[PDB]
Amino acid sequence: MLLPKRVKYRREHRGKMRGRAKGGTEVHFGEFGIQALEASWITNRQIEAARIAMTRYMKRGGKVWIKIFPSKPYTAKPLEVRMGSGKGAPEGWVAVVKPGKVLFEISGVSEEVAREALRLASHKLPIKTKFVKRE
Amino acid sequence: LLANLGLKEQLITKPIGTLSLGERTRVKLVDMLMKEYDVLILDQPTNHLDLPSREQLEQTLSEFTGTIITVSHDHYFLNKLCDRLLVFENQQIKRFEMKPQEYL
Amino acid sequence: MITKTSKNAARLKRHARVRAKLSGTAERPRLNVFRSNKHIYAQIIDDVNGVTLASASTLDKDLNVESTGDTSAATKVGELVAKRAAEKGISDVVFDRGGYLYHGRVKALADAAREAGLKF
Amino acid sequence: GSTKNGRDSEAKRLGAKRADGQFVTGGSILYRQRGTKIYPGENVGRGGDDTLFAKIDGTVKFERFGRDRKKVSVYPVAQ
Amino acid sequence: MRVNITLACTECGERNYISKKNKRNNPDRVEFKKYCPRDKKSTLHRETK
Amino acid sequence: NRLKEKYNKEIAPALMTKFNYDSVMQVPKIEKIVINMGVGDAVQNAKAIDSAVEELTFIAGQKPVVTRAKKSIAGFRLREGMPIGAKVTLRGERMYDFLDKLISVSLPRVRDFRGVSKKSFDGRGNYTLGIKEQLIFPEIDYDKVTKVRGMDIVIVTTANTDEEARELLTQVGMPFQK
RNA sequence: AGUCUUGGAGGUAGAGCACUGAUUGGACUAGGGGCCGGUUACCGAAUUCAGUCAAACUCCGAAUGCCAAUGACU
RNA sequence: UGGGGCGGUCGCCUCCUAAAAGGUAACGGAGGCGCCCAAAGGUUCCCUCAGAAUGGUUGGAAAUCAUUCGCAGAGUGUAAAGGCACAAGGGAGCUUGACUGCGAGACCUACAAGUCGAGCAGGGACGAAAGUCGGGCUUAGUGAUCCGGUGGUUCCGCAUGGA
RNA sequence: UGGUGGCGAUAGCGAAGAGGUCACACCCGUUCCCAUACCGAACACGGAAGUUAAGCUCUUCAGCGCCGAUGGUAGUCGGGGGUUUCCCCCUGUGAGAGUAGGACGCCGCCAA
RNA sequence: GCGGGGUGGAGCAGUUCGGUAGCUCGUCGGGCUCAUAACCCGAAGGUCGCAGGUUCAAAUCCUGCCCCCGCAA
């Protein structure tokens, strides 16, 4: 599971997810990619599951770029406690994905094979996504 | 060594003129310990020295295998440390092969 | 190799520092001095308008001396500019040492300006 | 658990205290600040704690001070 | 270690000023020329014992 | 001085002809010579500085300035502001006087001397040669000396390139290693 | 007091990478370990090219709101 | 006080939350303070820092030099923020303004407090002079009243003089 | 030309040139004033042997840096709507980035 | 997550307040004995859990990191 090696602050505001992706909206490195249509948090667990799905289907042929990184920490309070008495402890790591962001890129395979690999990955993710080609 | 003799950084940085008369003597002792020597001449070694320092000196000198020459009018200290005597009598120095207590 | 910084560039730094606390006004203008290898110059400039009221150097026809880059010449220059200032109704001035150490020729020019009757 | 945070100092009401174009009596505090966000211009002093105050009566004028810095001036009214 | 002190004027004795000093750095009674309001002039003030 | 007078009359015009400059001002000359005694044993021995300053005094014929560490370094147990070096700046006559003695006497007396290296230029026409023992200098008496300290001698020139500086030092009489 | 006009203080939204942190791929890499001082696609500092990201990052930077000034209309 | 209890907190400083004036809560997110300096203050004068490459006896990645590049990538007693390279950073000479009486007018503010202040007078430090100096780059380093101790005093003193 | 000011680097860096009779410099000395944590390097004090090589001044260059629209877009004020962690429409406003382009200084005073 | 421990081979001090690393037993070598034990005579064995700072000097003070033991878990 991806996570930063250190962070400036362990506990961050959840923030807001308005507007389209600031950058990274086009396929830049690979030939094919999967593009987000909705905003959502993507946990490192979801990235790991998606990457394994797409890479296994490609039989370790061709490169996979992960264009999102789970930098944002999120917390959770202990089970069965009342409100208050301080912010929760850091639980996990998420990447904030806004509409337009290309999450994964694939290269070194046919489009037909690429489409299937990215379809399998998309079903591991909690957002709707479309297949895109580079320009 | 100074620290072991109870002179800490404070006293070390001060002019010797400020040190107590026994503190001045612990400073002179360190100048002796730092010498790589074979003989110890102790001229009145028990003046200006407190019980802990005198007791420690007594223990150490009993173990020392080199030559010790000590002048002291504390006959107890002499009688514990010295086994032979040079007596100054009638403008003559005579050597006696006996302890201070026996000679008297 | 060794690039030598220009003395003038260094001098301008010292002069700028002087000018932080010191500036010529209409009533009490700034007597600025410049000291070259060969000559010495004095201007009396009001800084609110950027106008030089009086001036005198070792290039004027009044001064007759050959070695113009020494204390004797500097004394005459300070005297001459100070006379012209009194004619133009300048009594009080601020001395701007131009980044030079207040010594030798510049000090000599200053002394001449006081005797001629500038209040500083 | 329990929080190790929860402290803060009183707000120091910094910032501009008179407007550009406004008439001020001498002594009036013009700007409170840490360091020199704004510099003292004409007829303005800088107090011990960087406060900018009018040295005379006049109109406050905030002005560009070179390329990246600002200053405030007080200009006496044209009688 | 660092203590409050009072400086008395050495002419009139008045304890005109209070200040602090670090006793290890300045163990001796400090002296300072300071304005004495009674004498209406600057005078040597010495730390009181 | 022999070397100084030699430069003004013979060497300077010769170098003008060599590189065909537009002005005599363009001829490389030697501006200053700094001799540095890295006193790294000043941390351990307190009187290490006094040894280096007494040698430079005789060697340079000019009172050195004691240089100190800019920052603390753990490896050497060095605290900022500790005197750990000596330095002396020679200009003008005293520079030539020392350089004359250095070339004529000191470098020959180096134990198994084989000429100074050709690679020891900074890249912009400044030479630095490392002296290892202070015995080569005839001012230093063997008996009084306790420790065998060396030194660095930086020749700073106005030559833009190393080639032009090398030509300058050669004619001055620098024993280059063939 | 409202509105219009004019001036000004400020660093948010957005945006951006110029600093501080986090971070992807390639290049170049000092070293580091595992092999016989010579190499492994073996951990790899740093540098650079492109590309992301930030409540407690900013080369920038609004809309509003705020403080005034001069008339005008109310 | 997301019942009470435990734990934590209680006064002050800095930042974020705070939504571009100011202000703004939660047992919201981060840290500091209860000092330090007799120079680390004042003034006069001078001055640039970190880092890298190359050259060099010990010398080694890194001690001291020397050249080139090099906006601050350093430093600024002490947190953080805001400032600072006509320096507020570094060095040197002399000094004690780390002054006395004050104070137009402002900020902040329920009050009590807190903050800034030109200028005036007295007597001074530095400076040739202008001029600067009522501590420190700025913002923490603190505690009302009552009651006691001490020093000064053209005050009072229970008939009067003292006490 | 030299000095001395004002103005956001459109004023700067970098590159290629050109100039000095006078002026500015480099440059030549340390008896004196003054000086360097050492050094006449600097700061001082004096001089004029020669050099435009550098500084400086004057040219040309858009290579770096700087300035900078219009349009579009994000955001946003006010007013609505919806499928409401958000999104869309209307009045107004309107960036940042990117770009056309600007720009290798403009305006003073004194002296020679 | 909350506390307590890491000092020669074993068990323990010394830590706050910096100043030669120690006590008991054990291990090793040599004696005594026919031989072993006891006993006698010498020595080794920890740089104080590990890695860096502060200091002239750190087991001791500071910073991180790794183990052991209690609970909750």
Next chain:
RNA sequence: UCGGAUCGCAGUCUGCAACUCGACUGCGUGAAGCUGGAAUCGCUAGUAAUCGCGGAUCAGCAUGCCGCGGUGAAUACGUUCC
């Protein structure tokens, strides 16, 4: 100027042959060692102690072994104890 180890260099002799692995010589080098803890051994007179000499083995090689003489002591009260 005790002590002679170790080591460098150069040699002699024996032997087919002195590297592993010989004795001796010359030059140079100049170690530990300042009378030795617990403990323990020999000796009653020409003995102990000390000084040399010879011989067997043997081409060469002894600080060992077996012999020889030179100088030449101290002490034995006694049987309490091992």
